Amino acid sequence: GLGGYMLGSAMSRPLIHFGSDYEDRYYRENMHRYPNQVYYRPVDQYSNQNNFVHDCVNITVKEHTVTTTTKGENFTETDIKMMERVVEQMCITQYQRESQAYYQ
Numbered sequence: 274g275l276g277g278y279m280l281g282s283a284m285s286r287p288l289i290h291f292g293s294d295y296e297d298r299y300y301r302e303n304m305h306r307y308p309n310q311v312y313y314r315p316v317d318q319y320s321n322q323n324n325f326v327h328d329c330v331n332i333t334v335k336e337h338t339v340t341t342t343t344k345g346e347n348f349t350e351t352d353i354k355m356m357e358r359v360v361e362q363m364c365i366t367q368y369q370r371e372s373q374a375y376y377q
Contacts, residue, residue: 275312275332283309287362289355296351306346307356308337311364316371329364330357 286309289300300307312333314325334356341348348356 275336278312278332279315281311281313281363281367284311284363284366287359287366289358289362291351299351300355307352307359308333308363311360311367312336313364313367316368316375322368326361326364326368330360333360333364 286304286307289296291297291300310333311329313329316325319325334353337356338348338353340346
C-alpha cells in the first residue's frame with residue numbers, strides 16, 4: 274500500500290546523541306541494523322511538511338520493522354525511537370536539500 278513512493282539512495286547516517294556512552298556505541302556498533310535510506314515522496318506532488326515527513330517516517334519505520342519481524346529479528350523500545358530519530362533526521366535532511374534547490 275506504499276503506492277510506489279521515492280526511496281532515497283543510501284545516506285549519511287545522522288549521529289544520534291542519546292546522552293550516554295552505552296547507546297552512543299550501541300548505535301555505532303549495529304548502525305546497519307537501522308536503515309541508511311529514507312522512503313519518502315518527491316516534493317513534486319503532495320508538497321507538505323508534516324503530511325510528507327511523518328508519512329515518510331511512518332512507512333519507512335513500518336516497512337523496516339515489518340521486514341525484521343518477518344525475518345525473525347526483533348527491535349527493543351530504544352531501537353524504535355532510534356529509527357524514529359534517525360529516519361526523521363535523514364528525511365528532513367533530504368527535504369532541506371531538495372526544497373532548497375526547488376526554491377533556487
